[PDB]
Design an enzyme around this catalytic site. Structure first.
Site, PDB file in Angstrom:
ATOM      1  N   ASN A  53       7.951   7.739   9.347  1.00  0.00           N
ATOM      2  CA  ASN A  53       6.828   8.657   9.219  1.00  0.00           C
ATOM      3  C   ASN A  53       6.784   9.721  10.296  1.00  0.00           C
ATOM      4  OD1 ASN A  53       4.876   6.034   7.933  1.00  0.00           O
ATOM      5  ND2 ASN A  53       5.431   7.906   6.855  1.00  0.00           N
ATOM      6  N   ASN A 100       4.606  11.678   0.653  1.00  0.00           N
ATOM      7  CA  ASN A 100       5.058  10.960  -0.531  1.00  0.00           C
ATOM      8  C   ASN A 100       5.745  11.897  -1.512  1.00  0.00           C
ATOM      9  OD1 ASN A 100       3.577   9.154   0.900  1.00  0.00           O
ATOM     10  ND2 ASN A 100       2.419   8.365  -0.850  1.00  0.00           N
ATOM     11  N   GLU A 149      -4.997  -5.863  -2.536  1.00  0.00           N
ATOM     12  CA  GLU A 149      -6.228  -5.132  -2.285  1.00  0.00           C
ATOM     13  C   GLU A 149      -6.508  -4.235  -3.479  1.00  0.00           C
ATOM     14  OE1 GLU A 149      -4.670  -4.239   1.443  1.00  0.00           O
ATOM     15  OE2 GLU A 149      -4.131  -2.155   1.034  1.00  0.00           O
ATOM     16  N   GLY A 198       0.768  -6.304   5.590  1.00  0.00           N
ATOM     17  CA  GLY A 198       0.973  -7.702   5.308  1.00  0.00           C
ATOM     18  C   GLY A 198       1.634  -7.866   3.965  1.00  0.00           C
ATOM     19  N   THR A 199       1.011  -7.309   2.933  1.00  0.00           N
ATOM     20  CA  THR A 199       1.503  -7.536   1.582  1.00  0.00           C
ATOM     21  C   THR A 199       2.871  -6.900   1.382  1.00  0.00           C
ATOM     22  OG1 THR A 199       0.981  -7.283  -0.763  1.00  0.00           O
ATOM     23  CG2 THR A 199       0.186  -5.562   0.730  1.00  0.00           C
ATOM     24  N   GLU A 246      28.018   1.751  -7.770  1.00  0.00           N
ATOM     25  CA  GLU A 246      29.086   2.083  -6.835  1.00  0.00           C
ATOM     26  C   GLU A 246      28.564   2.281  -5.418  1.00  0.00           C
ATOM     27  OE1 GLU A 246      32.813   3.238  -7.001  1.00  0.00           O
ATOM     28  OE2 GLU A 246      32.899   1.726  -8.577  1.00  0.00           O
ATOM     29  N   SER A 267       6.137  -0.951   2.455  1.00  0.00           N
ATOM     30  CA  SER A 267       6.024  -0.804   3.890  1.00  0.00           C
ATOM     31  C   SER A 267       6.291  -2.152   4.532  1.00  0.00           C
ATOM     32  CB  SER A 267       4.643  -0.287   4.275  1.00  0.00           C
ATOM     33  OG  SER A 267       3.708  -1.348   4.339  1.00  0.00           O
ATOM     34  N   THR A 305       0.331   3.198  13.851  1.00  0.00           N
ATOM     35  CA  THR A 305      -0.898   3.063  13.093  1.00  0.00           C
ATOM     36  C   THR A 305      -1.323   1.615  12.914  1.00  0.00           C
ATOM     37  OG1 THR A 305      -1.907   3.446  10.934  1.00  0.00           O
ATOM     38  CG2 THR A 305       0.477   3.184  11.019  1.00  0.00           C
ATOM     39  N   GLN A 323       0.822  -1.203   0.000  1.00  0.00           N
ATOM     40  CA  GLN A 323       0.000   0.000   0.000  1.00  0.00           C
ATOM     41  C   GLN A 323       0.858   1.256   0.000  1.00  0.00           C
ATOM     42  OE1 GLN A 323      -3.463   0.883   0.320  1.00  0.00           O
ATOM     43  NE2 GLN A 323      -2.756   3.007   0.380  1.00  0.00           N
TER      44      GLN A 323
HETATM   45  N1  LIG Z   1       5.453   7.324   3.946  1.00  0.00           N
HETATM   46  C1  LIG Z   1       4.163   6.773   3.600  1.00  0.00           C
HETATM   47  N2  LIG Z   1       3.636   5.636   4.386  1.00  0.00           N
HETATM   48  C2  LIG Z   1       2.325   5.043   4.055  1.00  0.00           C
HETATM   49  C3  LIG Z   1       1.587   5.536   3.010  1.00  0.00           C
HETATM   50  N3  LIG Z   1       0.464   4.828   2.947  1.00  0.00           N
HETATM   51  C4  LIG Z   1       0.498   3.888   3.928  1.00  0.00           C
HETATM   52  N4  LIG Z   1       1.667   4.039   4.598  1.00  0.00           N
HETATM   53  C5  LIG Z   1       2.048   3.214   5.730  1.00  0.00           C
HETATM   54  O1  LIG Z   1       1.771   1.653   5.502  1.00  0.00           O
HETATM   55  C6  LIG Z   1       1.831   1.155   6.710  1.00  0.00           C
HETATM   56  C7  LIG Z   1       0.741   0.055   6.887  1.00  0.00           C
HETATM   57  O2  LIG Z   1       1.151  -1.038   6.171  1.00  0.00           O
HETATM   58  P1  LIG Z   1       0.505  -1.221   4.681  1.00  0.00           P
HETATM   59  O3  LIG Z   1       1.589  -1.576   3.697  1.00  0.00           O
HETATM   60  O4  LIG Z   1      -0.174   0.077   4.274  1.00  0.00           O
HETATM   61  O5  LIG Z   1      -0.628  -2.420   4.753  1.00  0.00           O
HETATM   62  P2  LIG Z   1      -1.131  -3.209   3.400  1.00  0.00           P
HETATM   63  O6  LIG Z   1      -0.291  -2.810   2.224  1.00  0.00           O
HETATM   64  O7  LIG Z   1      -2.589  -2.870   3.145  1.00  0.00           O
HETATM   65  O8  LIG Z   1      -1.037  -4.833   3.628  1.00  0.00           O
HETATM   66  P3  LIG Z   1      -2.496  -5.578   3.512  1.00  0.00           P
HETATM   67  O9  LIG Z   1      -3.527  -4.522   3.842  1.00  0.00           O
HETATM   68  O10 LIG Z   1      -2.603  -6.730   4.484  1.00  0.00           O
HETATM   69  O11 LIG Z   1      -2.681  -6.040   2.087  1.00  0.00           O
HETATM   70  C8  LIG Z   1       1.526   2.300   7.661  1.00  0.00           C
HETATM   71  O12 LIG Z   1       2.599   2.535   8.459  1.00  0.00           O
HETATM   72  C9  LIG Z   1       1.281   3.494   6.712  1.00  0.00           C
HETATM   73  O13 LIG Z   1       1.690   4.783   7.328  1.00  0.00           O
HETATM   74  C10 LIG Z   1       2.119   6.726   2.186  1.00  0.00           C
HETATM   75  O14 LIG Z   1       1.473   7.160   1.289  1.00  0.00           O
HETATM   76  N5  LIG Z   1       3.397   7.313   2.503  1.00  0.00           N
END
Ligand SMILES: Nc1nc2c(ncn2[C@@H]2O[C@H](COP(=O)(O)OP(=O)(O)OP(=O)(O)O)[C@@H](O)[C@H]2O)c(=O)[nH]1
Ligand SMILES: Nc1nc2c(ncn2[C@@H]2O[C@H](COP(=O)(O)OP(=O)(O)OP(=O)(O)O)[C@@H](O)[C@H]2O)c(=O)[nH]1
Ligand SMILES: Nc1nc2c(ncn2[C@@H]2O[C@H](COP(=O)(O)OP(=O)(O)O)[C@@H](O)[C@H]2O)c(=O)[nH]1
Ligand SMILES: Nc1nc2c(ncn2[C@@H]2O[C@H](COP(=O)(O)OP(=O)(O)O)[C@@H](O)[C@H]2O)c(=O)[nH]1
Lengths: 429, 430, 430, 429
Positions: free
Chosen positions: D196, D218, D61, D134-135, D244, D130, D169, D11
């Site tokens: 963050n 972002n 998702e 999960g993913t 390098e 991230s 979060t 995500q």
């Molecule tokens: N720097 C930044 N962090 C983000 C952003 N969107 C989500 N995050 C972070 O993603 C983290 C949550 O894990 P995610 O990767 O979003 O969860 P997911 O991808 O939905 O994994 P599943 O929902 O199980 O498929 C949180 O710490 C969020 O702050 C963004 O646009 N910029």
């Protein structure tokens, strides 16, 4: 002075035939009315005015051939070459090969002779037939035997729509498949396995058509056949004759079952977002997913690859890309064939049939590969056969037509000997 | 004087022949309709070596075409420079050999060899001094190899006094089109070792490398490689066609080269070839011509000579240069690459300087090397053949048309004897 | 006569080479398209020392470029004075050495050294009298150091009779760009001590100090320091390129300087350099030239000579001057700085006076000093190396590509032997 | 002939990807429609007309990737490289790494191969993910393992959005963080800690945006990535290759966790009232407050500093200012690295994305520093881990997917060994 003869027998055969003749009349622009505003391979000129195709349409159920007699092409074909029986074959080989075919083989051979006497450089026949059906099996075998005893040297190619592994549409179709092989094992030089599962998978992944229907299927098949015949029809840097096929791709005269593949098959919206370099197109060629038949060519070793390109082709760079694909460590050839790939080029770019889902792209590789993976199909298919013949299921619907009973077992043993070859020839030396 | 008949076979040979003929026409200044459009007189005093005065003041080439399929006919006719070839010489079949040697050498070509011999006799009876023949055909194609070697046996049992040269394009080992190639290759190399005097092998691998690294082209088209081989073919005898301070011919080649009645397989090389972007910088002089000529990847045979040596190396220069500079550079290059030239033959390099460069150049260099390096090529094609034979792969297509396996066995034996000969001469020193 | 091939490696070497070539072109009066646009005849009688007559009356430099990444290619092409270099000499790779010496000396550069040697042989076989080579490359960059030292070993095992000079730009110790520098520095200083005759070190610290205090510039751009080194590079042999009352060459340098087969690391110095605001006041005569030349911070090496001495000091003057004044000033400066010149070699200073000053000056002075001061530089780089090695910092990047630690151990040993040699000669007196 | 491959998985990864591709298409002016009115690093030309980015967008998702399929860039990407699963990963590593990913790794690898065969000078991959998710954890680890076993020599760089120290979060995000490290500890050469908390603090102090939202976050991250890739894309005095980096900044092949920093990030109204001298900008670079990750680099010793400038740069004076910062007695390096800073210059000044809060300023330093302070994060993070695993909280939601139970402890021990390095390598000799 270089022509063929296209026999379309059976239901699926004649449907693919309708589509393929659509394509042929379109790329030469031969209007469906039958008047044109190079074609001696297929259409012959009647001295003045119109053209007539070189194709007999044998069938016994007047439904589909009647629809053709009333379709858009009612004025194209000759009012005689469309033979319609009286009854059906009903999926039991004995019917379409002993009782009914005994009456229509005479008329078909008379027609075939009257066509072949009106040509000067005939090269090879091109039959089309399904196997699960009755007529596409019985009548196909019968014609193959009669033409082989009548003509001799000429080379015959088939396009068999074999039963898919899992998705099925008939029940006795294993039976009248095996027998159709025990004939087609001899009187034909190249049998291309055109399956129905792989093609639907393809239309679900590449062209993104979500609900594929038989029309798109037959369109794709017509595309492959035209890409094969482009060597005779149109110009080309590296012409290949339909007769050098029996020389290249049929090592041991018994093992002549080859599977095809086509690229690139893309819809427009992803077509623009893609360059389709010759390396890329020929790399999608060998990809196991889009193999026209249902197999994973990884499972065995290849034995020959006839790759024909059409469109803009930079030859030496094609050579480079072929070398790269030979470096791809998952496709390996048997020991006894170091001369791996045979190629061919043609200038005529793919011709798109209007309305069809396929997008008009400049280059196109059609690859006919003889491998060892295809073997498993037979194996798997025999499985089905076994689980029926052990209990004599449906056998009486065969013995009713006077066909000897035991022949099944005989045929079965013959096809078992196929593996005596396949899993054998793949052995190193 | 010293007329030469051109013979073509198979579609590859035919494309190469059309290209060679258009290059020769554009050198002698002959428009595609068959009249003279140059300025000098040299180009017309020696017109009879290739062409014939055609009734009405026209000119027609003394070339013959053959193929078992009639596609190449209309191909070469519609193509540029087709109006020259006379409508008689087009002898063609319908069945097509279809990439099966026994077809084009025992079955069908055996039906047309009579007519092809009749027309060749009608074109060789009308000449006064026949310096010999030259052929161009692929050794993989059924029509090409079959028709060619059969015609060769016929004419060499006909005209023993004259020579028989073949611009044969062997199968490129790696970049390989067809998979039944080694059978045709070996069945043709057994025949060409019998009844031929100069067989210069050409492989598509070296041509692609050259058009891909030296000329810095982008999309190497078959027309282009054909044009390269056409340039080499012209340069071979253009020292004969025109006056020269040190003249030459075909038989002075035939004697100054082959030290043994069969060691007659040559490598070709053209110079100078350079890209267009770099065209404006380097100089057109004999130093750079020499440095560009002897390169391993400047030739048309995928055999790095540094894996062997040269029995002999002729160099036909074209243009106008101070011969002493040429000869000094030859002496220097031999005494610099003393190893690459075999010792038991002294001053094994030969020169021949003509007087007229080609169209668009000041100097030009054809380099014809009878080396002991291509034995490697024959070796590896033998490897292909053996691995394809001892399993009888695709054998029945040959067995059917009447040929028996004894032919294949003895032909592979003869090929092995040829390569053993090459190595046995590279070995012996004195 | 006495041709010289220019070789460049790495992006730093390439920028310096482009700058040097544009300065030489603007001296010999060669426009960026490759024709002559001067007035005299001296600039053309000695054109062959650097350039070649390019087919059509053009001129192309006899320089070769190399880099494992293709960015520098289009950089130097789009840059000013790019049309000269011929499209052949551009040999380049794709992977990029990426600042890892073993990459550019064992893994990837080892794949291109064959081709670079072929082109260098094609450019050295076409000369008649080859006075030697000169190189320009940074000793920190993977491509630079690796490609360079490998090419050096190759050519010095090829041409032992000729010389091999390297305008090497060592890492400025303090103002340091990369942190894996000492490894490359030491692995290159072990190779240059083997197969080189003149290695003049240049450090960015001294160049910044000069462009920051003498010329009184404001924003020292890399182009500017490159231009300074280009001026020094020209002045080195411009006494050879043109007539002179006391001529010189490269080998008279090679003999009048290095008293021991390895003590061959020189410092450079240019004169006269002065700001624009002060340009109109001071005079262009040999007194001020001398007072400006021998200064500690006038050189291109962060080694205050007052921390050592000079084994020998050549001075190549350019322009027109009464030689007696030059020689009297030399005698006076030696007998004034008697300590700074080591005693066991008498009259250790050498002069060489040419006749044509550069473009835009009346006099010019190149000062080439083989001193015993840069041993300090090597010492401190050794300190860096040891403190980075005995913890094996960043070692696995080198260990991975095949090089073994034994190379590093023996190379640091060799560096320590070099500095011990320098000190052992500064010590001994007689 | 010098390109990369940008995999955006998860995500947060795909959100930063959307923003970063916004930036890339803008500075090359590649219109969001996909037609341009140097780009071979990212966008490839499709022979004629349009361009397609080098980026696969793996996610399960369909929400965010669907919004992209309907966003402003619906016509840019290829209609295939946007893979959408069927269900979610739900923060438990076992799901996105054992059950689901087992199905999508095949499609992702096929896509990756089809892209890498269409390039000539590939240098390094650039994944984005991230960890709390999960993913972004499971699928990221899975792809890293598959690419490492498939490609070998190439260098992989990651951009992990680790859990902030205090502001959180998710709840199970420590768990599927630790495991994501135990994979990312091996198959990746550089992991940049993008946190963050520090970024929100920054937007609260520098840009004065009072209520920062994920878009600005972002945007800043995209800025850093473009400032990194400027060396390959645009011209520059002192080019640096993305290869390098594995040579400079990764001393001991296990300790490759680096934290970034960017300057100058100013809003207009204070931008005019400021000169931003190179000394000043690089003095704000080393300032502990604006470190992109949440750490106080004072707490330990630095080990390497890759400082890349872009814009008007006076080199020797940059050298002077770097020397001055070396005199700054609070930033000290470990004994075994005297060659402190590695630098790079590029001429292309920062490109401002229209509408973004960031002001267009001439010079910009992006500094990637490998230090010893970063260690504490792991330490602190393990703390959280401890306080859960001791009571087997949430463990069954992991053991449900067939993942072995004890692996946690194993992974934990591995990460504990990290400190066996860090607080060790910072010891003088
Ligand atoms: N720097 C930044 N962090 C983000 C952003 N969107 C989500 N995050 C972070 O993603 C983290 C949550 O894990 P995610 O990767 O979003 O969860 P997911 O991808 O939905 O994994 P599943 O929902 O199980 O498929 C949180 O710490 C969020 O702050 C963004 O646009 N910029
Ligand atoms: N690829 C393809 N297969 C078809 C098509 N139409 C029918 N088939 C297949 O034909 C097979 C059934 O055998 P058929 O030949 O149709 O039966 P038949 O010709 O009616 O034989 P009888 O009905 O007894 O006269 C099935 O597997 C069909 O999928 C088509 O248009 N394209
Ligand atoms: N250099 C070159 N080789 C060609 C060309 N065309 C065909 N060849 C080769 O000709 C070989 C096949 O022989 P072919 O003449 O087609 O079969 P034939 O009809 O039996 O003689 C193949 O190796 C082709 O690659 C061409 O245009 N240029
Ligand atoms: N005096 C000067 N030094 C430079 C210049 N450009 C790069 N250098 C140095 O070149 C060194 C890096 O070597 P480099 O050529 O970039 O790496 P390579 O690609 O492996 O050869 C660094 O010390 C740079 O500072 C320049 O323009 N002028």
């Amino acid at each position: 002075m270089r022509e063929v003869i296209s026999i379309h027998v059976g239901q699926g055969g004649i449907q693919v035939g309708n589509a393929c003749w659509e394509l042929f009349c379109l790329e030469h622009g031969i209007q469906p009315d039958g008047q044109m505003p190079a074609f001696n391979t297929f259409f012959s000129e009647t001295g003045a005015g119109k053209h007539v195709p070189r194709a007999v349409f044998l069938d016994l159920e007047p439904t589909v051939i009647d629809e053709v007699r009333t379709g858009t092409y009612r004025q194209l074909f000759h009012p005689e070459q469309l033979i319609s029986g009286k009854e059906d074959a009903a999926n039991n080989f004995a019917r379409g090969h002993y009782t009914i075919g005994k009456e229509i083989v005479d008329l078909c051979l008379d027609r075939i002779r009257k066509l072949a006497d009106n040509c000067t450089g005939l090269q090879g026949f091109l039959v089309f037939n399904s196997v699960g059906g009755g007529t596409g099996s019985g009548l196909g075998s019968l014609l193959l035997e009669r033409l082989s005893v009548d003509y001799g040297k000429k080379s015959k190619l088939g396009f068999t729509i074999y039963p898919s592994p899992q998705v099925s549409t008939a029940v006795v179709e294993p039976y009248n498949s095996i027998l159709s092989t025990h004939s087609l094992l001899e009187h034909t030089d190249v049998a291309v396995m055109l399956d129905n599962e792989a093609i639907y998978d393809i239309c679900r992944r590449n062209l993104d058509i979500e609900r594929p229907t038989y029309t798109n299927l037959n369109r794709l098949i017509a595309q492959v056949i035209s890409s094969l015949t482009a060597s005779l029809r149109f110009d080309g840097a590296l012409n290949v004759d339909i007769t050098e096929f029996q020389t290249n791709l049929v090592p041991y005269p018994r093992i002549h079952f080859m599977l095809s593949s086509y690229a690139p098959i893309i819809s427009a919206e992803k077509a623009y977002h893609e360059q389709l370099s010759v390396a890329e197109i020929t790399n999608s060629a060998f990809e196991p997913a889009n193999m026209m038949a249902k197999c994973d060519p990884r499972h065995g070793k290849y034995m020959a690859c006839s790759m024909m390109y059409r469109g803009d082709v930079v030859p030496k760079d094609v050579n480079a890309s072929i070398a790269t694909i030979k470096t791809k460590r998952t496709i390996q050839f048997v020991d006894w064939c170091p001369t791996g790939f045979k190629v061919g080029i043609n200038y005529q770019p793919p011709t798109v049939v209007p309305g069809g889902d396929l997008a008009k792209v400049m280059r196109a590789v059609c690859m006919i590969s003889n491998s060892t993976a295809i073997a498993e199909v037979f194996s798997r298919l025999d499985h089905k056969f076994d689980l029926m013949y052990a209990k004599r299921a449906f056998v009486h619907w065969y013995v009713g037509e006077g066909m000897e009973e035991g022949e099944f077992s005989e045929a079965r043993e013959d096809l078992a000997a196929l593996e005596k070859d396949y899993e054998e020839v793949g052995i190193e030396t | 004087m010293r007329e030469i008949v051109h013979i073509q076979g198979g579609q590859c040979g035919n494309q190469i022949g059309a290209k060679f003929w258009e290059v020769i026409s554009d050198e002698h200044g002959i428009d595609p309709t068959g009249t003279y459009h140059g300025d000098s007189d040299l180009q017309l005093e020696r017109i009879n070596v290739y062409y014939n005065e055609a009734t009405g003041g026209r000119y027609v080439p003394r070339a013959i075409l053959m193929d078992l399929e009639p596609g190449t006919m209309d191909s070469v006719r519609a193509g540029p420079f087709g109006q020259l070839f006379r409508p008689d010489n087009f002898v063609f079949g319908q069945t097509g050999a279809g990439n099966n040697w026994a077809k084009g050498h025992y079955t069908e070509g055996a039906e047309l060899i009579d007519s092809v011999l009749d027309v060749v006799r009608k074109e060789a009876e009308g000449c006064d001094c026949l310096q010999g023949f030259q052929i161009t055909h692929s050794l993989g194609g059924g029509t090409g190899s079959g028709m060619g070697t059969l015609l060769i046996s016929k004419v060499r049992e006909e005209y023993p006094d004259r020579i028989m040269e073949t611009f044969s394009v062997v199968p490129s080992p790696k970049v390989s089109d067809t998979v039944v190639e080694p059978y045709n290759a070996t069945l043709s190399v057994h025949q060409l070792v019998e009844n031929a005097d100069e067989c210069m092998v050409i492989d598509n691998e070296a041509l692609y490398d050259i058009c891909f690294r030296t000329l810095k082209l982008t999309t190497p088209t078959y027309g282009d490689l054909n044009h390269l081989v056409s340039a080499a073919m012209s340069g071979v005898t253009c020292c004969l066609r025109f006056p020269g301070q040190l003249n030459s011919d075909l038989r002075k080649l035939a004697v100054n080269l082959i030290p043994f009645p069969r060691l007659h397989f040559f490598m070709i090389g053209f110079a100078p070839l350079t890209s267009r972007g770099s065209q404006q910088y380097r100089a057109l002089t004999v130093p750079e011509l020499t440095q560009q000529m002897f390169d391993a990847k400047n030739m048309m045979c995928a055999a790095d000579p540094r894996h062997g040596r040269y029995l002999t190396a002729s160099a036909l220069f074209r243009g106008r240069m101070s011969t002493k500079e040429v000869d000094e550079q030859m002496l220097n290059v031999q005494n610099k690459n003393s190893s690459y030239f075999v010792e038991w033959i002294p001053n094994n390099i030969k020169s021949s300087i003509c007087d007229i460069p080609p169209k668009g150049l000041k100097m030009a260099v054809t380099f014809v090397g009878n080396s002991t390096a291509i034995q490697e090529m024959f070796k590896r094609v033998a490897e292909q053949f053996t691995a394809m034979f001892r399993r009888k792969a695709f054998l029945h297509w040959y067995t059917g048309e009447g040929m028996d396996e004894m032919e294949f066995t003895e032909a592979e034996s003869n090929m092995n004897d040829l390569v053993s000969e090459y190595q046995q001469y590279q070995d012996a020193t004195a």
